[PDB]
């Protein structure tokens, strides 16, 4: 297989943001790490002015600004998920802007398992070292000397394996870390002093303490207060030597606090963000003998569910979201309307998480549009994307699956909302509680404060995107699959929904339904309802019949003239058929553990028989049939793989992995289609990911594959990567178990970058290359422009 991957839409989810003085000593700068992109803005009264955008050969996991002594402006430390560490500077000479690499290295350890709490990265306030927590029981120190250009690091063993959070303390004479850890006795706060000369830990400035059973956040309070603040599920405590304070406000018990930010340089005010979108202000009270007098928490308002916060200036706060649009809000002294002090100023689009999507020619102009189910919880919405213009349709609940029915001119959307047992009460008005017409399921078949998922099928108009109808499902029913097809010889078009009956006392569902609805004359009508003995994980129309997965079984159904589903054949697989794809008479079955199974339907024998199989233990998030021989999948550690289908039975019955690639994204959905008006590229598969990035995979001929592979290998020698990460290292299929180089895949972003280099660089890349004629710059420009045409 010879494939080609490009990015139609870059990642939109914000995974980190910091504020500092990066571009200039005066400019107030906001740095945003999304997934692999780094956006540097200059904060102004008018808002944000995008100054630069950079691409990293890695997923940014740590991103901090620090100013060592002797530097006029701040440097930027970035660690990636593959442990590429780098120290960068913003160099500008007139209109020219580029990011210099002051230092770089790889801080991976040959052995050691990643800590479950994840990568932690902190910088001492005096910039004497960088402390990284990547593996259990180890603490990596990178000295911050002026000549450590290779970022040489040394480990210090930690007696406490389960470290929750850790910070560097302010005001300490020597580098001191305060961290929260958990042992069987409970959760404790400890402090150490770091000795670089001795390369070890010394007893910390103040003693060990005991904190809330679920204390999980540490804040380092700058001078004059000093000390640390521990934030847990019920209480907020402050420690500084012998000094100790504690509060247990009731306004925070409803939701965990997961992000914070300091408003004042003295630490008098902090921002706090909860999981449900509440923004609080934490206040520290000053007394002069300077010591902290008292803590108090005041709810500020409601924002989009925050992944991170950063106070810019003049009461403007940037809220970085992964589940919704990022926000620029204003903090007002006077409460307004209900009493919220937060006034949203600006919004920034975020398509992630893209959990499902479809391709539809809404205008019939022969150009495809993409309809995606984006966001989660109150951030859920539909996004319509076309050649890149984006339209938004908020739902205020979680969309899960989407289908299109051209005959009735509507979309069917599986959705879920969260209700509190109180009868169950909805927390807000959402799409499923505000439809023009609605119905509730009724079938003979089959505490206080708890949360329950209420599922609905929403019929939504394709023109105005109004919720025409909302059908609520049975209590404790989980709608999993959704198709829109014509079955048998019936002329009617139906929505078909597969469900499961989920009970917390039951690990694996034992009951489920397949419900056939018909949408007509403004009402949704239940046309049929078939009970099954498992969860209907997936469903596909199959030559006018219905193929479905029920636990570990693949069942075939026919639409009898009396409008009922009648079993045709069963195939009892050992694996759970989560993923179910069809092409012609071939069926691809996959489960969550990377097992792939290719079967074929025999029209004459009327049964299923296995064609091929490939069982390799690894997490798999999606699958697709590229063609009759090659199958594309998304595999753990943000990878793409391509399996392929001898004269010997033992060999013809085995798929071989002919392609591997490291994408850097978690792919949720594949779908055949394209957004360009309808060649070296044959085929097209769009895919949508957790971070909101939309990508495209096409197939290439071996000649073109080799030409573009040589162009790649020649571009890597001219293109100056940021952080000096190597492209082959970046794109190597990576798993916690092993690492292989990329095979069978052409990085189309690197290829398309060929049009950004200068003419001398084009000549250098193209030198001694054979197009039989020696290739020149113009020919390769033609190649790359034709390749860019595909999207």
């Amino acid at each position: 297989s010879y494939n080609y991957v490009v990015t139609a839409q870059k990642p939109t989810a914000v995974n980190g943001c910091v504020t500092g003085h990066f571009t200039s000593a005066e400019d107030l700068n906001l740095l945003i790490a999304k997934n692999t992109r780094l956006e540097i803005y200059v904060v102004t009264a008018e808002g944000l002015r995008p100054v630069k955008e950079v691409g990293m050969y890695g997923k940014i996991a740590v991103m901090e600004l620090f100013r060592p002594k002797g530097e006029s402006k701040d440097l930027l430390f970035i660690l990636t998920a593959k442990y590429n560490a780098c120290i960068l500077e913003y160099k500008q000479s007139g209109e020219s802007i580029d990011i210099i690499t002051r230092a770089h290295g790889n801080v991976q350890d040959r052995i050691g398992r990643p800590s479950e709490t994840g990568i932690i990265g902190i910088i001492d306030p005096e910039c004497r070292m960088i402390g990284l927590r990547l593996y259990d029981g180890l603490f990596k120190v990178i000295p911050l000397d002026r000549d450590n250009k290779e970022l040489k690091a040394f480990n210090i063993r930690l007696e406490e394996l389960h470290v929750i959070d850790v910070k560097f303390l302010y005001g300490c004479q020597a580098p001191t870390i305060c961290f929260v850890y958990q042992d069987p006795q409970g959760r404790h706060v400890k402090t150490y002093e770091v000795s670089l000369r001795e390369k070890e830990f010394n007893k910390g400035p103040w003693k060990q303490e005991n904190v809330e059973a679920e204390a999980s956040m540490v804040i380092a309070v700058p001078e004059p207060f000093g000390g640390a603040i521990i934030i847990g599920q019920e209480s907020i405590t402050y420690h500084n030597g012998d000094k100790y304070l504690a509060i247990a406000p009731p306004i925070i018990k409803q939701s965990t606090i997961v992000c914070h930010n300091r408003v004042d340089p003295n630490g008098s005010r902090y921002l706090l963000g909860d999981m449900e979108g509440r923004l609080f202000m934490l206040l520290l009270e000053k007394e002069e003998q300077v010591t902290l007098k008292d803590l108090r928490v005041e709810l500020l308002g409601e924002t989009s569910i925050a992944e991170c916060l950063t106070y810019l200036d003049n009461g403007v706060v940037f809220v970085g979201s992964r589940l919704g649009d990022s926000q620029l809000v204003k903090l007002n002294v006077d409460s307004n309307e209900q009493g919220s002090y937060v006034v949203a100023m600006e919004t920034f689009t975020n398509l992630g998480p893209i959990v499902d999507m479809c391709v539809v020619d809404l205008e019939r102009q022969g150009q495809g549009q993409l309809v995606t189910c984006s966001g989660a919880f109150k951030e859920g919405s539909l996004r319509i994307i076309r050649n890149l213009h984006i339209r938004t349709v908020p739902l205020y609940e979680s969309p899960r699956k989407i289908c299109y029915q051209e005959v009735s001119q509507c979309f069917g959307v599986l959705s879920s909302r969260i209700e509190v047992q109180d009868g169950t009460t909805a927390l807000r008005p959402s799409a499923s509680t505000q439809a023009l017409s609605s119905s509730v399921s009724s079938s003979k078949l089959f505490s206080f404060g708890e949360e329950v998922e209420v599922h609905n099928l929403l019929i939504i108009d394709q023109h105005t995107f109004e919720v025409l109808h909302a059908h609520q499902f049975l209590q404790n029913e989980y709608a999993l699959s959704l198709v829109s097809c014509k079955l048998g010889k019936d002329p009617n078009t139906y929505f078909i929904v597969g469900t499961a009956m989920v009970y917390p006392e039951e690990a694996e569902p034992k009951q489920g339904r397949i419900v056939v609805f018909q949408y007509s004359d403004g009402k949704l009508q239940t046309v049929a309802e078939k009970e099954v003995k498992g969860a209907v994980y997936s469903m596909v129309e199959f030559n006018g019949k219905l193929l479905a997965s029920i636990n570990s079984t693949v069942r075939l159904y026919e639409w009898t003239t009396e409008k009922e589903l009648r079993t045709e054949c069963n195939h009892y697989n050992n694996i759970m058929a989560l993923y179910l794809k069809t092409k012609g008479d071939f069926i691809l079955v996959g489960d969550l553990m990377r097992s792939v199974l290719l079967l074929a339907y025999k029209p004459m024998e009327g049964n299923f028989e296995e064609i091929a199989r490939d069982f390799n233990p690894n997490w798999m998030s999606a699958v697709e049939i590229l063609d009759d021989d090659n199958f594309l999948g998304a595999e753990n550690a943000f990878n793409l793989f391509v399996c392929q289908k001898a004269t010997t039975d033992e060999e013809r019955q085995h798929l071989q992995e002919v392609g591997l690639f490291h994408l850097g994204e978690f792919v949720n959905v594949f779908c055949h289609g394209s957004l360009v008006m309808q060649t070296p590229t044959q085929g097209s598969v769009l895919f949508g990911t957790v971070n909101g990035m939309i990508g495209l995979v096409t197939s290439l001929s071996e000649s073109w594959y080799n030409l573009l592979l040589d162009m790649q290998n020649r571009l890597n020698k001219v293109i100056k990567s940021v952080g000096k990460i190597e492209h082959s290292f970046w794109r190597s299929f990576h798993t916690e178990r092993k690492t292989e180089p990329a095979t069978g895949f052409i990085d189309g972003d690197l290829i398309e970058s060929f049009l950004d280099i200068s003419r001398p660089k084009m000549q250098e890349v193209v030198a001694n290359l054979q197009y039989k004629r020696e290739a020149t710059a113009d020919d390769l420009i033609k190649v790359v422009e034709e390749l860019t045409r595909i999207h």
Binding site: P114, P504, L592, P617, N618
Partner: protein, 374 residues
């Protein structure tokens, strides 16, 4: 109610006391190719962590073992698909950890106790002059997978991925907080719970507790790999399924398959005549800390995988009770065989002393049983 010392069966006291015992361990690189001597007469599918007692008496076997004790104490046990026409694709290495030499009743016999260590695939089999085969085998790696949420886990709520150690409410909270980020994907939380090592281990313990009424949690290993191998060693399943379980590299897949076997198994029938039901899965019970089923060696070097049950049916008792070489000290055995086909099924153990609990049970040899799966 039970009052038997469940640690007694695992000590294999019937093999004699004062057995020289070796400490230490020999482990091989996960992918290295090695050459290992094969013990011929072992028609058993050994599993890592399982204890194999042997009474070897052939001069070739005795000499090979005597050489082994002076070297790495590891030999090979091949998982034959066919008992006859030896044809093994997979196997496991057993490391001798107890050893005694004797000359009882006219010949020299070596009794050893070994324990399964590492699985492997059969790359080559070579006969040797002494008659002890040498197998060229590559060690098989035990793959470990991270949490399914590690890929999509949000950085902001990473710090919430630690739970206070500790029942329905606790597991509901564990599912709610561990798989919160399942909302970023296309599957629900209860789907990912079906692939969680901890939840699967707990669900398996909920049936190990049904078998062993007074099961102590501390006994079972606290990591999924050892737990899965231990559970696999004690399931009354035919050779096909045992080999299938043996070649599963993942601990999660092995746990899932073991759970499916436990849930689906209904009754155990005589293998020779498949139509007669000997017992049911609800009669099984654990008399030793190894589990319901364990391997024991009889006075003539034959290894039987005996499953203990409270009640059995369609069995004739033949011969006399005897406490000689009893595998369960304090009990007397009696040969039992199918009353439809007169094929040996196992023994009936009856307590010698009054007030012993249980007073009677049955030990059924695995090779003569067939589990029926719906």
């Amino acid at each position: 109610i039970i009052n038997f010392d469940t640690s007694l069966p695992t000590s294999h006291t019937y093999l004699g006391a004062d057995m020289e015992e070796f400490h230490g361990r020999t482990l091989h690189d996960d992918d290295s190719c090695q050459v290992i001597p094969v013990l011929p007469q072992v028609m058993m599918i050994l599993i890592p962590g399982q204890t194999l007692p042997l009474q070897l008496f052939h001069p070739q076997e005795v000499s090979m073992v005597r050489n082994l004790i002076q070297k790495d104490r590891t030999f090979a046990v091949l998982a034959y698909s066919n008992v006859q026409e030896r044809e093994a694709q997979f196997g496991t290495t057993a490391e001798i950890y107890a050893y005694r030499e004797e000359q009882d009743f006219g010949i020299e016999i070596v009794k050893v106790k070994a324990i399964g260590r590492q699985r492997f695939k059969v790359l080559e089999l070579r006969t040797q002059s002494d008659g002890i085969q040498q197998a060229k085998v590559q060690i098989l790696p035990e793959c470990v997978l991270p949490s399914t949420m590690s890929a999509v886990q949000l950085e902001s709520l990473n710090k919430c991925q630690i739970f206070p150690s500790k029942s329905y409410k606790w597991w509901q909270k564990y599912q709610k907080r561990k798989f919160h980020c399942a909302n970023l994907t296309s599957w629900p939380r209860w789907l990912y719970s079906l692939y969680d090592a901890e939840t699967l281990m707990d669900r398996i313990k909920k049936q190990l507790r049904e078998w062993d009424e007074n099961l102590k949690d501390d006994s079972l290993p606290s990591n999924p790999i050892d737990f899965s191998y231990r559970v696999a060693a004690c399931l009354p399943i035919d050779d096909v399924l045992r080999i299938q379980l043996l070649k599963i590299g993942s601990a999660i897949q092995r746990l899932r398959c073991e759970l499916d076997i436990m849930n689906k198994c209904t009754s155990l029938c005589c293998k020779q005549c498949q139509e007669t039901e000997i017992t049911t899965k609800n009669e099984i019970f654990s008399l030793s800390l190894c589990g319901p089923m364990a391997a024991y060696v009889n006075p003539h070097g034959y290894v039987h995988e005996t499953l203990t049950v409270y009640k059995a049916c369609n069995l004739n008792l033949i011969g006399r009770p005897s406490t000689e070489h009893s595998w369960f000290p304090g009990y007397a055995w009696t040969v039992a065989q199918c009353k439809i086909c007169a094929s040996h099924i196992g023994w009936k153990f009856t307590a010698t002393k009054k007030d012993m609990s249980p007073q009677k049970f049955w030990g059924l040899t695995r090779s003569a049983l067939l589990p029926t799966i719906p």
